[PDB]
Amino acid sequence: DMYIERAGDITWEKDAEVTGNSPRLDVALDESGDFSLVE
Amino acid sequence: GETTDGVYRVMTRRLLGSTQVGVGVMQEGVFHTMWHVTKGAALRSGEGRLDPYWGDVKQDLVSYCGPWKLDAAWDGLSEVQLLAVPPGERAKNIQTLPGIFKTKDGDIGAVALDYPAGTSGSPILDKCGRVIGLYGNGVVIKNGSYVSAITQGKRE
Numbered sequence: 200d201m202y203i204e205r206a207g208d209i210t211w212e213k214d215a216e217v218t219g220n221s222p223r224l225d226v227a228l229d230e231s232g233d234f235s236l237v238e
Numbered sequence: 239g240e241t242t243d244g245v246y247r248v249m250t251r252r253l254l255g256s257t258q259v260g261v262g263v264m265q266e267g268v269f270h271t272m273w274h275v276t277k278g279a280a281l282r283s284g285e286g287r288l289d290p291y292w293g294d295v296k297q298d299l300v301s302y303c304g305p306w307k308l309d310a311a312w313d314g315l316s317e318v319q320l321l322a323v324p325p326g327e328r329a330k331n332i333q334t335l336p337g338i339f340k341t342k343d344g345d346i347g348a349v350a351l352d353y354p355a356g357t358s359g360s361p362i363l364d365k366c367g368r369v370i371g372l373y374g375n376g377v378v379i380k381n382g383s384y385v386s387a388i389t390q391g392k393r394e
């Protein structure tokens with residue numbers, strides 16, 4: 200049995216921690232909703 | 239139950255203790271999450287029940303109490319923020335420049351940030367605070383890193 204609990208407001212934070220790269224990938228999406236890499 | 243707009247954890251007591259299986263967004267009286275978090279099951283909010291209303295396994299999305307309401311889109315140029323809600327930890331904003339998933343049916347934004355599986359359904363926002371999609375359906379690339387699609391539904 201699943202239940203929900205509030206965790207916060209949805210707002211943009213000024214000066215949030217900035218990280219992560221921006222990869223450009225060729226991908227395929229199957230009927231089950233799974234993404235996979237195309238090589 | 240609680241109908242206030244915002245980000246929520248999705249919990250279960252089926253396993254050991256209370257376990258966080260994902261996250262979702264309450265907006266305009268509708269609860270939005272990824273299909274793989276709830277498998278389309280009903281949810282409890284205090285003493286109230288939220289029934290599924292729309293869902294799609296291929297999009298990996300589901301809405302409760304009404305139709306999908308989120309329609310903002312990534313502009314393809316600007317940094318966005320993941321409003322990560324990890325299990326047992328406080329909600330935290332992470333800013334990033336999305337990459338791209340190129341598919342036979344078009345391109346989708348993607349965020350290269352690695353959080354526990356229970357963070358699935360966390361919202362990705364633009365600079366106006368609008369939800370441009372949900373984090374948690376993606377792929378594992380060559381160097382073993384996780385990259386999530388920015389998954390957004392259609393507002394009918």
Ligand SMILES: C[n+]1cccc(Br)c1
Binds near residue numbers: 353355357358375384
């Ligand atoms: C399925 N999965 C794996 C890693 C991180 C996330 Br969010 C989801």
